[PDB]
Structures are given as structure tokens and as C-alpha cells.
Short mmCIF file of C-alpha atoms and ligand atoms in Angstrom, two decimals:
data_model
loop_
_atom_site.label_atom_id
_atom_site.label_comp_id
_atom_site.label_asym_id
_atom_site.label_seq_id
_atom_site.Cartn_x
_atom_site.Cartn_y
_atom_site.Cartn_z
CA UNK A 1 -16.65 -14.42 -2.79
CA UNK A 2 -13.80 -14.65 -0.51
CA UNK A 3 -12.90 -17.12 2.85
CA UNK A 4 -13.54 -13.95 5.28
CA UNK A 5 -15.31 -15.14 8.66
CA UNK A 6 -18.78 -13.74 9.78
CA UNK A 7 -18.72 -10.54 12.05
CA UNK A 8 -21.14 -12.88 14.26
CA UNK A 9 -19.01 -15.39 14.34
CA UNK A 10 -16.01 -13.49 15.86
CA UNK A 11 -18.01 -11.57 18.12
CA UNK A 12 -19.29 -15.24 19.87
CA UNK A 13 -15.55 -16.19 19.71
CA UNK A 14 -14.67 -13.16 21.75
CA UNK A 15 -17.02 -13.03 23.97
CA UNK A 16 -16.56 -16.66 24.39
CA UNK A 17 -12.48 -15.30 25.17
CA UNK A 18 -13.68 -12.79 27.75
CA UNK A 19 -15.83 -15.04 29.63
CA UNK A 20 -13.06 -17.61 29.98
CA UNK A 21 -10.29 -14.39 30.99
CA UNK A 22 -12.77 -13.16 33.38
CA UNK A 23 -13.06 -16.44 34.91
CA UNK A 24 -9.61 -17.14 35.52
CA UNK A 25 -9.59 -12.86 36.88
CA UNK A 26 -12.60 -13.65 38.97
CA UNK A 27 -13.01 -17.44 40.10
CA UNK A 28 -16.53 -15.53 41.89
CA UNK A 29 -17.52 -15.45 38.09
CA UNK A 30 -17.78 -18.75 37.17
CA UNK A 31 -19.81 -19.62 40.54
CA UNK A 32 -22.32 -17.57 39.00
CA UNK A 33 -21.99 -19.32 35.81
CA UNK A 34 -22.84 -22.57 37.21
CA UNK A 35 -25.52 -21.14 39.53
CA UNK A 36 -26.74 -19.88 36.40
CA UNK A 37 -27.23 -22.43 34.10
CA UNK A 38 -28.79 -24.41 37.25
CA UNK A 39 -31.62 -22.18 37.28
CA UNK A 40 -32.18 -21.80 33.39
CA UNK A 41 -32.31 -25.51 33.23
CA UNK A 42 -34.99 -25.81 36.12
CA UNK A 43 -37.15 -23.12 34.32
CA UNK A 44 -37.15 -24.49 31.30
CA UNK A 45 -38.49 -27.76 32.73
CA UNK A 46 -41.15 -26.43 35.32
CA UNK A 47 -42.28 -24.00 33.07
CA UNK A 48 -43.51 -25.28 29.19
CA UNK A 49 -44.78 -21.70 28.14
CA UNK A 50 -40.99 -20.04 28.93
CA UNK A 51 -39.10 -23.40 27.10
CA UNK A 52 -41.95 -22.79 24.36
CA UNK A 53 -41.19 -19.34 24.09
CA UNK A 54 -37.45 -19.31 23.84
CA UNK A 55 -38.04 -22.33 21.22
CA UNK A 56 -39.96 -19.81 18.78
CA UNK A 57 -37.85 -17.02 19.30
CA UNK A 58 -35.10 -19.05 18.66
CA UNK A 59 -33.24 -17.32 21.90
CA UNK A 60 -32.61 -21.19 23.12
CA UNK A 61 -29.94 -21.67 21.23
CA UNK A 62 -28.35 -18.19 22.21
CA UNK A 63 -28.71 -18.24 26.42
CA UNK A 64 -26.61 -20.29 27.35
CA UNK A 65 -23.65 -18.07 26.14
CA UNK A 66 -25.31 -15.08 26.20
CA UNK A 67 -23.52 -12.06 28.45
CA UNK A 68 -22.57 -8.17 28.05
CA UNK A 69 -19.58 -6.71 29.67
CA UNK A 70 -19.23 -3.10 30.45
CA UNK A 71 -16.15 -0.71 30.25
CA UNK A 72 -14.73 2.74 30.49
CA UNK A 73 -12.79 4.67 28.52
CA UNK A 74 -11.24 8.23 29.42
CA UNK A 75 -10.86 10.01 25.83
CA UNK A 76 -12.64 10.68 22.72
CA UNK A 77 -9.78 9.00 20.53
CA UNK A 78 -10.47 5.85 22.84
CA UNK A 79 -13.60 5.73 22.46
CA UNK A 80 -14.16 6.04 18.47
CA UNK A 81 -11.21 3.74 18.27
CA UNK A 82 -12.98 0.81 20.53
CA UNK A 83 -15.78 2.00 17.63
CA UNK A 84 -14.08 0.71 14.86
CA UNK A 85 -12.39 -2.28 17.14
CA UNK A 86 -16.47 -3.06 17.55
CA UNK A 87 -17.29 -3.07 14.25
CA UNK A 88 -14.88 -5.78 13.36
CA UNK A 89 -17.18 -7.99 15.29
CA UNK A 90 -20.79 -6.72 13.98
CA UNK A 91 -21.08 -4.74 16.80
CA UNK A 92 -22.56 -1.15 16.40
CA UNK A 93 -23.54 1.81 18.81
CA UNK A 94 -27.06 1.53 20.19
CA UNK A 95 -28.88 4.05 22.86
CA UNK A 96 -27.27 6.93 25.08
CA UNK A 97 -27.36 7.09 28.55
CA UNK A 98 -26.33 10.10 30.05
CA UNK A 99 -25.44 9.69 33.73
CA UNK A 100 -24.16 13.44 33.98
CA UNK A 101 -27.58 14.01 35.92
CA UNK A 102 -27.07 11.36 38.63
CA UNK A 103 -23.67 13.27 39.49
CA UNK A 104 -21.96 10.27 37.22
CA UNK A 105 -19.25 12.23 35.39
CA UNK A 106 -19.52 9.27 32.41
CA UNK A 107 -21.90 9.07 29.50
CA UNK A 108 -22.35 6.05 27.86
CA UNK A 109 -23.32 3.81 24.75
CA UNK A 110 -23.95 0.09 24.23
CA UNK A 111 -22.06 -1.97 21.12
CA UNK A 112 -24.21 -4.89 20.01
CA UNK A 113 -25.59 -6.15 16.94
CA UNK A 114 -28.56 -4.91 15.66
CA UNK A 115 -30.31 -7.69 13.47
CA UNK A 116 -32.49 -10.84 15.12
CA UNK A 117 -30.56 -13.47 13.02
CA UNK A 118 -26.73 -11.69 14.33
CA UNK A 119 -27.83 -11.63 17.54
CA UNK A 120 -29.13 -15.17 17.62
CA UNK A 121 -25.62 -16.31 16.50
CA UNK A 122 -23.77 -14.12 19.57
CA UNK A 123 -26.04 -11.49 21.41
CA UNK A 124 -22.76 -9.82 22.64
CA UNK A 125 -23.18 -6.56 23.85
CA UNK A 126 -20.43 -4.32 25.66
CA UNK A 127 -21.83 -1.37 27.19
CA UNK A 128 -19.39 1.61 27.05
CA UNK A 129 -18.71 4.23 28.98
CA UNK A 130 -16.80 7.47 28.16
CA UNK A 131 -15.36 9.60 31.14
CA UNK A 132 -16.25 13.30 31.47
CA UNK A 133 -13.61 15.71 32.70
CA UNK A 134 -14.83 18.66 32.54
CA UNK A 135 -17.61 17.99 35.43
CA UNK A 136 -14.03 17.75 37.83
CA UNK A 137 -14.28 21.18 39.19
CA UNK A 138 -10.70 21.20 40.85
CA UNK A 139 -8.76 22.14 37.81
CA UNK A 140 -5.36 20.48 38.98
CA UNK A 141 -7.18 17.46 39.29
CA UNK A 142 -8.56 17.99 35.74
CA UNK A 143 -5.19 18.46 34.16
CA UNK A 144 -3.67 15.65 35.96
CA UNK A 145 -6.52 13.37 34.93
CA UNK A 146 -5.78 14.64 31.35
CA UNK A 147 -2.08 14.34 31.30
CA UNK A 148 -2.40 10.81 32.31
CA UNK A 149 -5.25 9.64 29.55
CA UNK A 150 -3.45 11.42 26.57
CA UNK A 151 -0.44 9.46 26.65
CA UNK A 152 -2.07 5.96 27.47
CA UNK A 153 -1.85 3.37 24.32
CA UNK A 154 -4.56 1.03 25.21
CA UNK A 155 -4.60 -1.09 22.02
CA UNK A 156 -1.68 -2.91 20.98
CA UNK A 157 -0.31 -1.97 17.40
CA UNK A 158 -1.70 -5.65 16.15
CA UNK A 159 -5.11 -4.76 16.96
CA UNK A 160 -4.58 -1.60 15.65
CA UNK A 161 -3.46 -3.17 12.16
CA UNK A 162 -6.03 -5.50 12.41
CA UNK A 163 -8.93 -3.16 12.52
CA UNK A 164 -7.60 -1.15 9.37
CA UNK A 165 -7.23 -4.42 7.30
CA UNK A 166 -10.88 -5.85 8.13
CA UNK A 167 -11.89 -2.39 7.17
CA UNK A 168 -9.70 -1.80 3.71
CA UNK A 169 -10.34 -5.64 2.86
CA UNK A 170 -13.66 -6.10 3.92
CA UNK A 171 -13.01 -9.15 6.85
CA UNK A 172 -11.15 -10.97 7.81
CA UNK A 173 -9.90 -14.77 7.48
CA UNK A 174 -10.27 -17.36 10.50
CA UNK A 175 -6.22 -17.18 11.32
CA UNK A 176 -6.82 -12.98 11.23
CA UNK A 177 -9.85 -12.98 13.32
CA UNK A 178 -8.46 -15.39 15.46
CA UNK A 179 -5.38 -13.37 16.33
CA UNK A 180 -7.61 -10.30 16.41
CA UNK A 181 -9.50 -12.14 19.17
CA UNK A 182 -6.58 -12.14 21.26
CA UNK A 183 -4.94 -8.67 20.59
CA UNK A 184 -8.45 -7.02 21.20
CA UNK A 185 -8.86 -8.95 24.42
CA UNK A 186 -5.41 -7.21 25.76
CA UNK A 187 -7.48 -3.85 26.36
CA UNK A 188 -9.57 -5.52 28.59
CA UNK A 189 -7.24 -7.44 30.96
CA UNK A 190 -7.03 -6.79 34.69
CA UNK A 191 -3.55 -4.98 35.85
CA UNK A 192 -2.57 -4.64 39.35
CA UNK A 193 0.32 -2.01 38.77
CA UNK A 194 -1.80 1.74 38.94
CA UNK A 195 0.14 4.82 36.67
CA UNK A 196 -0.25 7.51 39.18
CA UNK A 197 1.56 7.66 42.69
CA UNK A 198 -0.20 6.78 45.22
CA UNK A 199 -0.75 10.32 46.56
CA UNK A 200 -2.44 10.55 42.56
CA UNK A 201 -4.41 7.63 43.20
CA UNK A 202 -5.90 8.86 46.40
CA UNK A 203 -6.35 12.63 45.05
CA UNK A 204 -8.37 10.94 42.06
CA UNK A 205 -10.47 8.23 44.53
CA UNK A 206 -11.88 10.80 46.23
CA UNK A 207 -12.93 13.11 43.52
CA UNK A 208 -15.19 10.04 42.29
CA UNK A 209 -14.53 6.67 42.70
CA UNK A 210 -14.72 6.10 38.91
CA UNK A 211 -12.21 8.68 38.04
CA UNK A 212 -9.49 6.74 39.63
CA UNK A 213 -10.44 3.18 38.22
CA UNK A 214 -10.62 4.93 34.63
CA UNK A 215 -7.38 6.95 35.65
CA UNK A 216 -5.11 4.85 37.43
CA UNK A 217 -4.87 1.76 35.22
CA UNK A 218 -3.28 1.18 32.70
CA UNK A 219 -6.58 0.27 30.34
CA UNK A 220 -10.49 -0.41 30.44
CA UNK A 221 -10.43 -3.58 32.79
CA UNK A 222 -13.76 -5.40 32.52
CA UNK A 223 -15.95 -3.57 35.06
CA UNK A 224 -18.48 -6.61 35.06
CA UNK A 225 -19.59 -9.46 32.62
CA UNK A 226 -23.07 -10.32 33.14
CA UNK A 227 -24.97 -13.35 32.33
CA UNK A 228 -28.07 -13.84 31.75
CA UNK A 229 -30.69 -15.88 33.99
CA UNK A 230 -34.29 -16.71 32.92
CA UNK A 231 -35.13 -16.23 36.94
CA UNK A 232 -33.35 -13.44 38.77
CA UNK A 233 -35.41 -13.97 42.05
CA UNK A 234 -34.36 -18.01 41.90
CA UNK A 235 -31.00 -17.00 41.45
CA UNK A 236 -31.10 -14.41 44.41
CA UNK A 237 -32.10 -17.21 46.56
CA UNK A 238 -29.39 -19.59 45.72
CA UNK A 239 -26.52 -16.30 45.63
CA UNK A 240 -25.83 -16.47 49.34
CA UNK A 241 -25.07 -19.76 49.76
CA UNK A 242 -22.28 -19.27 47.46
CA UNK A 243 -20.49 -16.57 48.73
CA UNK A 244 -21.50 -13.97 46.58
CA UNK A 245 -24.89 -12.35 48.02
CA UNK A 246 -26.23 -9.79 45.90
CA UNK A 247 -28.06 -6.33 46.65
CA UNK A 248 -31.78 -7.16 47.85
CA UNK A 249 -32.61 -3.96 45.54
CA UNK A 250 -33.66 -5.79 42.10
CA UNK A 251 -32.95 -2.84 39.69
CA UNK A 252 -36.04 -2.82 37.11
CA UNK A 253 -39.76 -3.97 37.15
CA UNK A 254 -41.11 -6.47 39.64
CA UNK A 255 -41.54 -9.63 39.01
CA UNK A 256 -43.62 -10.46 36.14
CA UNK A 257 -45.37 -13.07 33.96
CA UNK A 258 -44.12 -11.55 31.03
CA UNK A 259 -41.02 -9.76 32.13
CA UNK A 260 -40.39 -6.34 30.55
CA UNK A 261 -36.89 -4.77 29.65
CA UNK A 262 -34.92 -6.51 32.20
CA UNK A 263 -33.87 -6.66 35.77
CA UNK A 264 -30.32 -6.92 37.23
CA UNK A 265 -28.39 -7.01 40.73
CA UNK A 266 -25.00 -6.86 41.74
CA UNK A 267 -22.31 -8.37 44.31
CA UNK A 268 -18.88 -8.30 45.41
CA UNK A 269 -17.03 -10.24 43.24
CA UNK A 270 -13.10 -10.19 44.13
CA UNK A 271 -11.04 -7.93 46.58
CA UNK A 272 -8.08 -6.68 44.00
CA UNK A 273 -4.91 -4.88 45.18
CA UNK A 274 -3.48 -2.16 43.18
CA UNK A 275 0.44 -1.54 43.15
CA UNK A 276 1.88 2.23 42.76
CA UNK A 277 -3.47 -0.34 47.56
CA UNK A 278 -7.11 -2.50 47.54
CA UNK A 279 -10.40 -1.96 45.47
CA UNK A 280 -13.43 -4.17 44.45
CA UNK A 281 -14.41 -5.84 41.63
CA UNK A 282 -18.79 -6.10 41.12
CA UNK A 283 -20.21 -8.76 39.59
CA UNK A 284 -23.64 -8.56 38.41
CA UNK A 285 -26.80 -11.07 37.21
CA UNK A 286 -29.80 -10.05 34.98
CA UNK A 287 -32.55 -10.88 33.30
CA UNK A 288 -34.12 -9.84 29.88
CA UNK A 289 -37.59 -9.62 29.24
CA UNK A 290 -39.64 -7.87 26.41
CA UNK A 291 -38.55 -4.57 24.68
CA UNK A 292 -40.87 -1.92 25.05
CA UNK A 293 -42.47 0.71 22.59
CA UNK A 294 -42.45 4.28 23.21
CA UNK A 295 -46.04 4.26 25.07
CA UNK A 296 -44.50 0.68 27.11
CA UNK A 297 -41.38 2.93 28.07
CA UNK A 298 -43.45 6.10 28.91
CA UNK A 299 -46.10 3.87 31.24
CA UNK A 300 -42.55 2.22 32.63
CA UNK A 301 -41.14 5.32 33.67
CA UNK A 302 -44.44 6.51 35.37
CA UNK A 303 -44.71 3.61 37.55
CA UNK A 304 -41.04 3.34 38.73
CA UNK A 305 -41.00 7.58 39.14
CA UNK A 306 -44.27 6.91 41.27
CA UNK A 307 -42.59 3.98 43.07
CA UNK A 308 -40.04 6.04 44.45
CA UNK A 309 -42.08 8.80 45.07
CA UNK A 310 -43.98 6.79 47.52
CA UNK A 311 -40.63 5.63 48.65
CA UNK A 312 -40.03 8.98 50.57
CA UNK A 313 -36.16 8.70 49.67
CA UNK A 314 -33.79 6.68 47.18
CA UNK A 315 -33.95 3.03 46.73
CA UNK A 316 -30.86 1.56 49.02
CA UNK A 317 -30.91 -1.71 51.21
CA UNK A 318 -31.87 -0.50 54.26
CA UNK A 319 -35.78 -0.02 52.98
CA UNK A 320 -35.54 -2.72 50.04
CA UNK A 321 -38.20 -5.10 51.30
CA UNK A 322 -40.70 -1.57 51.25
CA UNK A 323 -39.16 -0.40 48.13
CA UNK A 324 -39.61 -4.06 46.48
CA UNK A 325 -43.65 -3.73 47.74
CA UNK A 326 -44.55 -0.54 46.97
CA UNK A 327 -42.41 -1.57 43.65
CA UNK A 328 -44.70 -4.19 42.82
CA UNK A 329 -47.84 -2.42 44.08
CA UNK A 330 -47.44 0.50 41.73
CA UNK A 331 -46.69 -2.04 38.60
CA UNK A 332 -49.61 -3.49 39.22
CA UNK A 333 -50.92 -0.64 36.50
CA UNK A 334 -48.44 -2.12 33.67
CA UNK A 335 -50.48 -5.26 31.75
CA UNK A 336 -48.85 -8.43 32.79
CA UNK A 337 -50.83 -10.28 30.03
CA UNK A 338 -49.18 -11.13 26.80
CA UNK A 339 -51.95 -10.19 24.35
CA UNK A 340 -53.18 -6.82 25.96
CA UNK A 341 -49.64 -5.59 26.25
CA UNK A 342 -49.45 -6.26 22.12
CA UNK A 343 -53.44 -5.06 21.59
CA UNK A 344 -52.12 -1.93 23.59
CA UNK A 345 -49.14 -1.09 22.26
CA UNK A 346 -46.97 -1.50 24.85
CA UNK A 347 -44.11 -4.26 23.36
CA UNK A 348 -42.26 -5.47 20.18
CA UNK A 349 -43.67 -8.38 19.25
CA UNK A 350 -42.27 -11.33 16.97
CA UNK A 351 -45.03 -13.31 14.95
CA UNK A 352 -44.13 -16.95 13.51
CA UNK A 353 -46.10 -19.10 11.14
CA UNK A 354 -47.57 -22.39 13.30
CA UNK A 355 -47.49 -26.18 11.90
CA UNK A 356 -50.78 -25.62 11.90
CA UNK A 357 -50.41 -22.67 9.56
CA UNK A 358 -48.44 -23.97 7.49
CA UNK A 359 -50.85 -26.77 7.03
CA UNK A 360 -53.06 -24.48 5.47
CA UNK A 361 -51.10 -22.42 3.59
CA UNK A 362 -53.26 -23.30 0.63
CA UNK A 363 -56.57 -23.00 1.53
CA UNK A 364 -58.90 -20.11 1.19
CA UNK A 365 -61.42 -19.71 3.69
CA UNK A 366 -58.93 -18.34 6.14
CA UNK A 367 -58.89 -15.52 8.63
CA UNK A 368 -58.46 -11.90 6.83
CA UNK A 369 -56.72 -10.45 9.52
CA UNK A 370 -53.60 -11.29 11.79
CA UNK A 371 -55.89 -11.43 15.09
CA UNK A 372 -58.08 -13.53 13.12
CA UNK A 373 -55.15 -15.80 12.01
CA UNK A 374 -53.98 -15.96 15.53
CA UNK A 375 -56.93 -16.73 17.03
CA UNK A 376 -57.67 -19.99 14.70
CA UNK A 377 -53.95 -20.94 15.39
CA UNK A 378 -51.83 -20.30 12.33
CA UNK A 379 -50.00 -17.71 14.14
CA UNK A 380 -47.94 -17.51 17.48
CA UNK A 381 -46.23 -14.21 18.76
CA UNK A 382 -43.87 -14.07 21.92
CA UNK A 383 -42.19 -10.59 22.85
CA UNK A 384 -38.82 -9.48 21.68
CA UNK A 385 -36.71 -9.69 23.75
CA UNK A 386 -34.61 -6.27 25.43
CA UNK A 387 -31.00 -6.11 23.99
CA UNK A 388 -30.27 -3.11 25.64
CA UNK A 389 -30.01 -1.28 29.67
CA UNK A 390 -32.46 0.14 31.85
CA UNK A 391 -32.97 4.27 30.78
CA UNK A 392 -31.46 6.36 33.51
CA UNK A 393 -34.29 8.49 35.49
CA UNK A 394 -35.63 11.63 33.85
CA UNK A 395 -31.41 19.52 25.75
CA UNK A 396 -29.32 17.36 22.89
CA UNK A 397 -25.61 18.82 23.77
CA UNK A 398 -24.82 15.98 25.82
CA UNK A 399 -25.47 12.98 22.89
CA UNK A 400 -24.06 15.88 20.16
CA UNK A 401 -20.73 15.82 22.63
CA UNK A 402 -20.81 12.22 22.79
CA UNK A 403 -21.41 11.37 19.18
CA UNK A 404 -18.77 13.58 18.33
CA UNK A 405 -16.39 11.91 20.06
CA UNK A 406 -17.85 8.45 18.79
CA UNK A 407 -17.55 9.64 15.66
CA UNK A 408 -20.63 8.53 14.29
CA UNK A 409 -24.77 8.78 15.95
CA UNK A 410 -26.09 6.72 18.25
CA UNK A 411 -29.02 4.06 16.81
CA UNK A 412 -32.18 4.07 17.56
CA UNK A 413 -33.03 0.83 19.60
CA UNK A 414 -36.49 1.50 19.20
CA UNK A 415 -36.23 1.59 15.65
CA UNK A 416 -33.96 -1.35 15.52
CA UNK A 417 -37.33 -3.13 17.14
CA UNK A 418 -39.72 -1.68 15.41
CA UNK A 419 -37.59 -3.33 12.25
CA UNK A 420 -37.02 -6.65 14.10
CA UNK A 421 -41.29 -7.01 14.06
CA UNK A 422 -41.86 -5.83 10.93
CA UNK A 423 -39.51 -8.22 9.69
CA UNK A 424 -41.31 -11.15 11.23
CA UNK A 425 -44.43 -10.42 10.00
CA UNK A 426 -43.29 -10.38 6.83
CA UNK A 427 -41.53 -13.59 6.69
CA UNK A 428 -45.00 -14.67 8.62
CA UNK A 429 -46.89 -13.87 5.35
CA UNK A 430 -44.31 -15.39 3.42
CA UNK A 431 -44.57 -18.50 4.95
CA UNK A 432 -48.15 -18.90 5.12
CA UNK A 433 -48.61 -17.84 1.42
CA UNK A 434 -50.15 -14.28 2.02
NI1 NI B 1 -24.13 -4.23 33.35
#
């Protein structure tokens, strides 16, 4: 057909880009990294079922690499531009969180791919957040904050050219991608020198601390990269000794068995000074676990509302060892047991023909039905795993505002699940000649 590269395979390629740039930003960073892969290698060897698991799912091959990054952007025409800059790369909008009801004046998206076999080749995801101005109620503030985004360029012209060839051509070559890699990865450098005064700067700060970071710089600076961990208590325990000690709040369920959606903490990552003078860089850790239906999500949400009901206030460090027991006391409710938690309802599944199964593919004789089937052996399920970011707590103009300036809707993650099983059943059938 033609020598273009694979979306896939540009999107590894740049994340692989950003985690090195981070690095060198954020030497903190690649502690973590090494931490990291520390603990996924002792997991895998004290613990068969999890190296079993991420064998059939195939998500082996993936960890090791695997990360998101988040960013924010101050302006429609930013964000449907970083749109099409995404799509180069595979990448397409998934899931709206609206933080406008946690007094967060940013509502937000996630980029990632959307298919099991793209996201085993790079699960890259960059979750995205778009700046809301009209929540600043002091209206020279607003304007300011205005004048300053509208004449920002935060893609250079190459990228810029880039994008519009992949699209009118269809891809790109491996020279093309390769300098698209680097031009994209401009928007997302650090830079110390600020664009407002530093009168500006403070007016901004105080407003909301996010205003000025999206504000005063020149571009959307990574705001974290996060990789991910197969054990986010082990690494909490090993996090202090390296200079880096994270929030005793664990965002997310309790531990778990069978982890669901995921869990994630943060730390101080790297004092920065800004030049018109000091702010923080946050690093973060998480870990994925299975994605969750519709009824998983609703019992999810009861639990964790209940949790910090019992609380008596809002989850912060001073009360996390209470919050982290009444947190797993009130989970207790949510099936920690792989096979009621799919005979329930509760979690995508993926389902994979066994040696065994395939064995047998020719005999008659067998099990009628898929319980039957995986009860003699011939198939083996493990959860899908979560791809996208824990729901903030709980009508449409919010996601109609933001998918207007997107310029296209949201997808449906649960439907991009519900897709991702379906798909392995039938390849299941395939496989075992039914
Ligand atoms: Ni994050």
C-alpha cells in the first residue's frame, strides 16, 4: 500500500520521547522508574496467578513502558488542535470529567487508543485538561487571563504541517513521524521564563493555583507522567527511602485481590523556579486493575460515597490511616473474587482459548455453554484491564461546551469495553472451532 508507519508505533516512540525529557526535567522521575520496575519484577515472581494473568492478557509485554501524562490547555483552538496532534498517534478522546463541581475551573478528557491490540503495542494515554474562564468571577482577571491565551502559539509551525500531511496523505513515513516526534514534544517542555509580570503571576496564583501554571507559561508543561506499578502499597513502602514520599491517602479502592479501576498517589517531585519566583512539580504512581461495567461503577461509587460519609469530613492526611480503614471496611461489600464479579456483572472480562482447548477443538462431546467450557478447562478469562481515571464524585451543558470546543464527542469507555469482550469471545469461538 504505501511505507507509512503505524499510529501505534509512533505513539510508543513518543511516549518513549517524553519519558526520557521528563527524566532529564525531573531526575525524581526516573527514581520512581527504577523503584518501579523493582517491584513489578518481585510480583511477578512471588505471585504465579498475577505473571499468569498479564501472560494471557498479553499486558506483559506492554508494562514495562506503560505511562500517561497529563496536561492543560487554556483555549478551545488548543485543545481541538492537540485533537488532531493526537490522532496522528492513534490516540482518540475517551471519557469526560468535569471538575467544575469540585471548585476545579478545568474540565477534562483522556487521549488513548481505543482497541486491545493498539494498546498492547503503546497503552499511551495523555489525560487533558481544558481551562475554564468563565468560573473567574473578577472580570479583570478574566480578561487578562484571556489576553494572554489568545496570542500564545504553542505548536511549532512543523508540527503544525505535520498534522495536516498525516491527515491529507493518510500517515506518515518513519523520517516524518520521526521528526513529528520531536516537534510535538516542544509543547510539552518545561520553561522557566513566565509571560506575565510578576504582579500578573501573583494576581493569577491566587485566583487558583492552576490558573497561573496554565497562564503564566509559555505552553502545557507535563503536569505529571505516571507509571504504572503492579503493587502501589509495595511501592509506598519503598517511596520514602528515596526521597520522594508520597500522600498516605491511596486515591481509589482498597487493596484488593483483583484490583478494580485503579489506584494512584502523588509526591513532590522537583522545586522549579519561574523567571518574570518558585513552584512544584507532582509526581504521581498508580496502579490499574479491572474496568468496571455500569452496575461495577454504580456499586463503586456507593461504597467510596459511604466511605467518606463515615469519614465525618474530606479525605486529607491528617485522618488517612481512619480514612484507609473505614475505606477498606466499607469495600468489603464489592466481590473480591474473580468469577462472582464476572457471574455478577460487575467487570469486562477477556476470555482466551486454553492448550487444553485447543486440544479439543475437534471433538464433540464438549460443554454447550461458556461456563461449561470454562469449568472443564478450555477456557480462561482475566479482567480487562482500566485504561482510563477514577470518575470525579457525583445536566449535559458542561460535555456539550467541552465537545464543542474538542470539536468532536467524547467516546464511550464503557462501550469501548464492552467491544474489547465481545471481541474476545469471538476470537475464543474461533479458535476452539465453535
Ligand atoms: Ni494522572
Amino acid at each position: 500500500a504505501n511505507d507509512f508507519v503505524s499510529p501505534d508505533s509512533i505513539r510508543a516512540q513518543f511516549s518513549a520521547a517524553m519519558s526520557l525529557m521528563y527524566k532529564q526535567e525531573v531526575p525524581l522521575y526516573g527514581t520512581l522508574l527504577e523503584l518501579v520496575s523493582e517491584i513489578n519484577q518481585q510480583v511477578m515472581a512471588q505471585q504465579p496467578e498475577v505473571a499468569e494473568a498479564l501472560r494471557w492478557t498479553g499486558e506483559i509485554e506492554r508494562l514495562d513502558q506503560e505511562r500517561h501524562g497529563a496536561i492543560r490547555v487554556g483555549t478551545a483552538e488548543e485543545l481541538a488542535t492537540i485533537a488532531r496532534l493526537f490522532a496522528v498517534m492513534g490516540m482518540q478522546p475517551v471519557g469526560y470529567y468535569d471538575l467544575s463541581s469540585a471548585g476545579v475551573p478545568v474540565h477534562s478528557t483522556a487521549f488513548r487508543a481505543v482497541h486491545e491490540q493498539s494498546l498492547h503495542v503503546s497503552p499511551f494515554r495523555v489525560f487533558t485538561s481544558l481551562l475554564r474562564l468563565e468560573l473567574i468571577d473578577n472580570p479583570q482577571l478574566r480578561e487578562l487571563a484571556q489576553s494572554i491565551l489568545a496570542k500564545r502559539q504553542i505548536f511549532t509551525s512543523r508540527a503544525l504541517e505535520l498534522i495536516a500531511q498525516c491527515e491529507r496523505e493518510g500517515g506518515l513515513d518513519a523520517a516524518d513521524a520521526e521528526t513529528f516526534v520531536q516537534e510535538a514534544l516542544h509543547t510539552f517542555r518545561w520553561h522557566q521564563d513566565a509571560t506575565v509580570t510578576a504582579e500578573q503571576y501573583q494576581q493569577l496564583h491566587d485566583q487558583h493555583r492552576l490558573i497561573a501554571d496554565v497562564v503564566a507559561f509559555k505552553g502545557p508543561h507535563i503536569n505529571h507522567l505516571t507509571p504504572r506499578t503492579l503493587d502501589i502499597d509495595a511501592i509506598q513502602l519503598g517511596m520514602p527511602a528515596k526521597g520522594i514520599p508520597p500522600k498516605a491517602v491511596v486515591e481509589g479502592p482498597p487493596t484488593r485481590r483483583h484490583p478494580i479501576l485503579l489506584r494512584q498517589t502523588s509526591f513532590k517531585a522537583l522545586q522549579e523556579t519561574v523567571a518574570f519566583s518558585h513552584t512544584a512539580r507532582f509526581g504521581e504512581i498508580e496502579q490499574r486493575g479491572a474496568a468496571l461495567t455500569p452496575k461495577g461503577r454504580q456499586l463503586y461509587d456507593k461504597l467510596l460515597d459511604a466511605t467518606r460519609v463515615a469519614l465525618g469530613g474530606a479525605p486529607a492526611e491528617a485522618n488517612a490511616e481512619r480514612y484507609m480503614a473505614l475505606l477498606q471496611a466499607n469495600f468489603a461489600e464489592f466481590p473480591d473474587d474473580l468469577a462472582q464479579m464476572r457471574e455478577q456483572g460487575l467487570a469486562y472480562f477477556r476470555y482466551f482459548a486454553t492448550e487444553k482447548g485447543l486440544a479439543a477443538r475437534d471433538q464433540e462431546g464438549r460443554p454447550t455453554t461458556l461456563q461449561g467450557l470454562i469449568d472443564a478447562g478450555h477456557v480462561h478469562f482475566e479482567a480487562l484491564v482500566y485504561e482510563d481515571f477514577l470518575p470525579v464524585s457525583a445536566s449535559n451543558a458542561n460535555r456539550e461546551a467541552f465537545e464543542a470546543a474538542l470539536g468532536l464527542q467524547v467516546q464511550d469507555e464503557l462501550a469501548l469495553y464492552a467491544q474489547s469482550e465481545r471481541r474476545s469471545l469471538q476470537a475464543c469461538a474461533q479458535a476452539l472451532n465453535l
